């Protein structure tokens, strides 16, 4: 059936704030339109159906509107717990030849808390990983906002390969992230260098953690 286009693709608003997101149908669908919340790693939750009717248990600070082709979801008094992706969906059966159940593409909502710099941990590879011929150095950035960038240095040289980053969902209480960054090297590479450095940057702020292989 109809194609649903959601905008913006991502929104960021402060705690306590109000965000309005949009769903547009390629053809008229009356009010046969539902809204869902999906937090990372969780199942979808119905928020709203028939465009504006609140699902059971959902607070009135969620407000849906629209008919025909243009729909909105407004969330007020934003909480860190509201950080999620939000989907609209056409839900309708007229007949065997006239039905629709398609979703919009989703809108990611980031909720902004106060800025806080991370504390940073670094973990040298254990002896038994070194034995495998490949090592992984792990850097963890705890409890931070907003987003960070990670740089790795080995004896002062910036690494350009072998890096993988993984970010947790926003904390439901304080909106902060955690991040693991790993640098993978051969055991030969690892044993040929001394200083290993993880640098975690937020704009004009950086937090740097290092170790010296000889000392471990």
């Amino acid at each position: 059936g109809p194609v649903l286009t959601q905008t913006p693709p991502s929104a960021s608003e402060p705690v306590g704030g109000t965000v309005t997101i949009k769903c547009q149908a390629s053809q008229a669908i009356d009010e046969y339109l539902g809204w869902y919340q999906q937090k990372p790693g969780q199942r979808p939750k119905l928020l709203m159906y028939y465009a504006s009717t609140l699902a059971s248990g959902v607070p009135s600070r969620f407000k849906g509107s629209g008919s025909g082709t243009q729909f909105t979801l407004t969330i007020s008094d934003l909480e860190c717990a509201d950080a999620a992706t939000y989907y609209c969906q056409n839900y309708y059966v007229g007949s065997s030849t006239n039905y629709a159940f398609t979703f919009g593409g989703g809108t990611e909502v980031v909720v902004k808390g106060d800025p806080v710099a991370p504390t940073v941990l670094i973990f040298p590879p254990a002896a038994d990983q070194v034995a495998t011929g490949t090592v992984t150095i792990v850097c963890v950035a705890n409890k931070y906002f907003p987003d960070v960038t990670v740089t790795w240095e080995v004896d002062g040289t910036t690494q350009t390969t072998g890096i993988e980053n993984s970010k947790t969902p926003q904390n439901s209480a304080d909106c902060t992230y955690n991040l693991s960054s790993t640098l993978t090297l051969t055991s030969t590479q690892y044993n040929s260098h001394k200083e290993y450095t993880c640098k975690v940057t937020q704009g004009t702020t950086s937090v740097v953690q290092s170790f010296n292989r000889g000392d471990c």
Binding site: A55, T85, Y87, Y91, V93, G104, T136, S166, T182, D215
Partner: protein
Amino acid sequence: QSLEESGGGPVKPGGTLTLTCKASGIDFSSFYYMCWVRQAPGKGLEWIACIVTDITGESYYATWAKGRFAISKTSSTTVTLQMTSLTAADTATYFCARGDTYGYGDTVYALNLWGPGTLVTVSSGQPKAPSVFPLAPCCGDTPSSTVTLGCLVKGYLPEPVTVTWNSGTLTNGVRTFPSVRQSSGLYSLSSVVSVTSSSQPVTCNVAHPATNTKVDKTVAPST
């Protein structure tokens, strides 16, 4: 009322899976749409098919799903989704969902009930158990009243793995990061826990259902 999906797992491309959805605590005096919805890694929700639970057993398919996918009500509490000619494009979490039928306009005409989802991974790779490595701060580090220790869970296929700490005694102050998939198709992840430093050991317990493996790694303080 609740839904639970099953029958998900690894499959080779071209293979066939049949998922089933178990409905529990339901009202038999009412009729519903039972639907399957999938979600590719990092992607949006994608509707596959629905079926009405009345005597008609009438079904509704996404266009792309006609042919390869077959939904059917196989009991009063069970709906199945048949998937054939699988491609890695079909790798996704597969949700069972339920919503009301139209009635007199007086119903919850949307998908109000959802299962937790079942993971399907379409890959040519054989299931592979993870290697697990202890993460401890460098030996040269000044000791503190607390320490953060971890485990690196490397090179497994497919998702998921489960990581616990001291068999579930340690739950507060655990951070288990989302896996990262390497170009090889293998996955890795890390888990860390912050503890009050003590004589009690800290051990990560790593399970990988797809290979029926369970490994413990005791993390020395590196001291």
